Amino acid sequence: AQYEDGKQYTTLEKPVAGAPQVLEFFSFFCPHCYQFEEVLHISDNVKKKLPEGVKMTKYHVNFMGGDLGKDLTQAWAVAMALGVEDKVTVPLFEGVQKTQTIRSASDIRDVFINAGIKGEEYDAAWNSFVVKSLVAQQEKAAADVQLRGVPAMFVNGKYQLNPQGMDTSNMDVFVQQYADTVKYLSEK
């Protein structure tokens, strides 16, 4: 066929019931994730081609960057609870990977403050049980597909994107191929 198991995607041996439609995993320590966000705008180009009535979910993972990696998973829960994902994503990536000015939870917090989230609102969120279970959701979703690598995208808890098998001579062509693949899997 034109789309084949094991080529633009792989199938989960052990499917995950009730999973979000389009589920994406990343880490602010993950270099391809930086590319995916900053250079390729993957999430965004996927959305533009997805049917709608379709929700997109994006979660942070713990297995990179040790103690800071976890701080970052909790910060992303904060960002989700407050709905400020689109104001912190870029400065978090660049603070971890470009400028290397993020070294502690306090530095993560500074990014939110500079993006205009209020100190008190951030600290309340950070410490809230609504952020605790949000952290729990992220870990559970990662657990459910036994995740050892990012970036990763899963469709309907059944199919996992396989970017290794898409041409990378042209970045635009890669993105379209990637997004079209998600759409195809979405309709499967």
Could you give the CA distance from residue 53 to residue 31 in angstroms, rounded to a whole number? 31
Domain residue limits at 181: 1-188
Evaluate whether 10 touches 185 at the Cβ level (below 8 Å): no
Residue 23's DSSP bridge partners are 57, 154
Where does 28-171 show beta strands of DSSP type E? 56-60, 152-155, 159-161
Q: Resolution of the experimental model in angstroms, please?
A: 2.1
Q: Write phi, then psi, for 52 (nearest 5 degrees).
A: -130, 170
| Tokens at 182, concatenated | 């998600």
Q: Write phi, then psi, for 115 (nearest 5 degrees).
A: -80, 0
13 Cβ contact list (under 8 Å, min separation 6) = none
Provide the number of structural domains found in the chain: 1
- 3-state secondary structure at position 1: coil
Technique behind this structure?
X-ray
CATH code of the domain containing 26: 3.40.30.10
